[PDB]
Amino acid sequence: TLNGGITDMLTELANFEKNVSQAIHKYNAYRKAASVIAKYPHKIKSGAEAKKLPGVGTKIAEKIDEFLATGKLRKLEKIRQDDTSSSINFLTRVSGIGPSAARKFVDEGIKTLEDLRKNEDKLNHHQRIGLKYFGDFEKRIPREEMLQMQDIVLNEVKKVDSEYIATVCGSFRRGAESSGDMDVLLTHPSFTSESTKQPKLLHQVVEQLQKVHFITDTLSKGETKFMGVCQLPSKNDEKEYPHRRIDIRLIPKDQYYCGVLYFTGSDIFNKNMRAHALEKGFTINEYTIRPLGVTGVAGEPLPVDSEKDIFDYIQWKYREPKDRSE
DNA sequence: GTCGG
DNA sequence: GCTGATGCGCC
DNA sequence: CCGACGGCGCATCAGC
Ligand SMILES: Nc1ccn([C@H]2C[C@H](O)[C@@H](COP(=O)(O)OP(=O)(O)OP(=O)(O)O)O2)c(=O)n1
Ligand SMILES: [Cl-]
Ligand SMILES: [Cl-]
Ligand SMILES: [Cl-]
Ligand SMILES: [Cl-]
Ligand SMILES: [Mg+2]
Ligand SMILES: [Mg+2]
Ligand SMILES: [Mg+2]
Ligand code: NA
Ligand code: NA
Ligand code: NA
Ligand code: NA
Ligand code: NA
Ligand code: NA
Numbered sequence: 001t002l003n004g005g006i007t008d009m010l011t012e013l014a015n016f017e018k019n020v021s022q023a024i025h026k027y028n029a030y031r032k033a034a035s036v037i038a039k040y041p042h043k044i045k046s047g048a049e050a051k052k053l054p055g056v057g058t059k060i061a062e063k064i065d066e067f068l069a070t071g072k073l074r075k076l077e078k079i080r081q082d083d084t085s086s087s088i089n090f091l092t093r094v095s096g097i098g099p100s101a102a103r104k105f106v107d108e109g110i111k112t113l114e115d116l117r118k119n120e121d122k123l124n125h126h127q128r129i130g131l132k133y134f135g136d137f138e139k140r141i142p143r144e145e146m147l148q149m150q151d152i153v154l155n156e157v158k159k160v161d162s163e164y165i166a167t168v169c170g171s172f173r174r175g176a177e178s179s180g181d182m183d184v185l186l187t188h189p190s191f192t193s194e195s196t197k198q199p200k201l202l203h204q205v206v207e208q209l210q211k212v213h214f215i216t217d218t219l220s221k222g223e224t225k226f227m228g229v230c231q232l233p234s235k236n237d238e239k240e241y242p243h244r245r246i247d248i249r250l251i252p253k254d255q256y257y258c259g260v261l262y263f264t265g266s267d268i269f270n271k272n273m274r275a276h277a278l279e280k281g282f283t284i285n286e287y288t289i290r291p292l293g294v295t296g297v298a299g300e301p302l303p304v305d306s307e308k309d310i311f312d313y314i315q316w317k318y319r320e321p322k323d324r325s326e
Numbered sequence: 327g328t329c330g331g
Numbered sequence: 332g333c334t335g336a337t338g339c340g341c342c
Numbered sequence: 343c344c345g346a347c348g349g350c351g352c353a354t355c356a357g358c
Contacts, residue, residue, distance in 0.1 A: 017327090025347060029327040032347095057328045098339055126339075126353090170342070183342075220340080225351050227340070247341060249351085262349085265342040274348040285349050286342080329346090332358105339353075 003037050003044050009067055010034035010060070012076055019092045019099050020085050028271070033060050035268045035326055044068070087111035095130030095137060095219070095245070096123075126219045133229060136242035140178040145241065148232055149182055156208045157186070164188050164205065169263035170247075175322040181245035182230065185263045187253045193287070193301075194254070202226060202250045216243060224250045255287045257304045262286035269324045273316070280314045289313055 014030035017023045032055035037044065044050050046068065047061030056064075067073055079085050084106060091102035094116070105111075110119055116131050123131065130137065141149075150168050157166045167173075170183035186205060190198040206226050209215040217229035226248040232241040251259030262270060263286070277284045281292050288301035289310055304310055308318045 023327090026327055028347070032328085055328065059327060096339065100338060124339095124353090181341095220352050222352055225341085227352080249341080262342055267342050267348095270342055271348050278346095278348080283349085287350095327347105331344095331346100334358090335356090337353105337355080340351080342349100 003040065005071070006044060006050075006064055006067060007034045007038045009063065009073055009076065010037070012079075013063075015089060016076075016079055016085070019089045019102065020079075022099050022103075029055065030060075031268055032272070035272065038326055083111075091116075093138070094127065094134060096126035097130065101127070129217050129219060129229060133243045137245060139242050140180060141182070141244055142178050143172070143176065145232060146172050146179055146182065149230070149244070152212075152214050152232075153182075153184055153209070156212060156214070157205055160204050160208050161188065163190075166205075167260060167263075169260060170265060171325070173260075173264045173321050174266070174325050176325070181247065183263055184246065184248045185256075185259055186248055186250045187256055187259075188250070189253055191250060191252055192254045193252045202248065205248065215246065249286075251286065257307050257310065258284070258288055259286050261307050261310055264321050264324060266325050268326055269319075273314070276316065277314045282313055284310065 010030050011034050014027045014034065017030060018027035033053075036053045036055050037050065040053060044064065047063075047065035050056045050064045051058070051061040063073055063075070087106045088099070088102045091097050091105055091111075092099055097105070105116075105122070110116060110122070113131070113134060116123065120128060120131070146168070150172075153168070154166050157164045165187045167185045167187075168182065169185050170181070171179040172182070186202065188198070188201050190196070191201055202221075202224060206215060206218075206221065206228075209230070213231075213233075215228050215230045219227040219229070221227070226246075228246055229243050230246040231243045234240050249259070249263060251263075261284075274284050277289070278292075282302075283290050283292055283298045289304060290298035290301055293299055302313060311318045
C-alpha cells in the first residue's frame with residue numbers, strides 16, 4: 001500500500017482500456033507503469049518523480065499529479081458514472097465473456113447477472129459455466145484449501161502412472177496466502193520435444209480426476225491444455241466448498257524449466273522478463289529460450305538445466321518464485 | 327501509452 | 332478440410 | 343496512418 005492510491009488508479013485505467021476501449025496496448029502500458037511504481041521503494045511525491053521510471057510517460061505523470069493533488073482522477077469519476085462502461089466492465093468478469101462479447105451483450109440490453117440468467121440461450125457452454133459459478137469464481141482460495149487440492153491432484157495422478165510429475169504453479173508456487181485458481185504443470189517421460197510415445201497422456205489424468213468427482217466441468221480441452229472446474233469434498237451439515245477454476249498444462253519433460261518459469265508467473269513478471277530477453281537478443285516462451293537472428297528469426301533452443309539458467313542468459317539476478325509477484 | 331529505431 | 336484472423340483464456 | 347509492444351493453447355468463423 002506504499003503508493004497504493006496510484007497503483008489502484010492505474011489498474012482501474014488498465015481494465016477500462018482492455019475491457020471497454022479494447023485497447024490492449026494501453027492496458028499493457030498501464031499494467032507496466034503500475035508494476036514499476038509498486039516496486040519503487042519511496043513515496044511518490046510528484047508526476048515528475050514518477051516520469052523517471054521506465055513505462056511512466058507524460059500522460060501518466062499528469063494523472064499522478066492530479067491524483068496527488070486531489071485524491072481522485074476526474075477521468076475515472078466519469079468512467080464510473082457511465083452505466084454502459086460499468087456494465088461492459090462487469091460482464092467481462094464472467095469466465096468466457098471477453099470485451100467483444102460484453103459489448104455485444106450490452107448493445108442488446110443484457111447488462112446484469114439477472115439478464116444473463118434470463119438469456120442463457122445466448123451463451124455458449126463456457127459462458128454458461130462462468131455464469132453458474134460466478135460468485136464462487138470471484139472468491140480466492142485460502143492456501144490451506146490449495147494444500148488439500150494439491151493433495152488430491154498429486155494422489156490421483158500417482159494412481160494413473162507414478163512416472164507423472166505434477167507441480168502446482170501460479171500464485172501458490174509464489175508463496176501466496178491465497179490464490180485465484182489452481183494451476184497444475186504436468187510432465188511424463190513419454191512426452192518430450194523429440195516424441196509423443198503415448199497417446200492421451202493429459203486425457204488419462206483429467207478422466208481420473210473426473211472419476212473421483214474432483215473435476216466437475218470442462219471449459220476447454222486439447223492435447224496439452226485443460227481448463228475446467230473442480231471442487232473439494234465437504235462434510236455433512238457443512239456449507240459446501242466453492243467450485244474453483246483449475247488449469248492443467250502438459251509440458252514436454254525436457255522443457256520443464258521454461259514451462260515452470262512460464263506457469264509460475266506472475267503475468268507481468270513474465271511479460272517484463274520476456275521484454276528484457278528481446279532487448280538482450282533472445283526470445284522466451286513456455287518451451288524454449290532461443291537467440292534471435294538478423295531476420296528477427298529465433299534460432300535453435302539453448303540448453304537449460306534450471307530456472308536460473310534462463311535468468312543467466314539475459315543477465316538478470318535470479319528471482320525466487322516469491323519475488324516474482326507484483 | 328510509452329519508448330526507441 | 333485448409334490457412335489466417337478473431338475471441339476466449341493462461342502465466 | 344511510426345510501429346513494436348510477450349507469447350501461445352483452444353474454439354470458432356471467413357474465405358477458399
Ligand atoms: N519519434 C518519432 C516521431 C515521428 N515519427 C514519424 C512521423 C512521420 O510519419 C515521420 C516523419 O515525421 P516528421 O515530418 O514529423 O519528422 P521530422 O523529423 O521531419 O520533423 P521536424 O520537421 O520537426 O524535424 O516520422 C517517428 O517515426 N518517430
Ligand atoms: Cl491499444
Ligand atoms: Cl464453449
Ligand atoms: Cl527447459
Ligand atoms: Cl519453441
Ligand atoms: Mg492462478
Ligand atoms: Mg489459472
Ligand atoms: Mg491470473
Ligand atoms: Na519514464
Ligand atoms: Na471474462
Ligand atoms: Na499428499
Ligand atoms: Na472441447
Ligand atoms: Na453442488
Ligand atoms: Na546457473
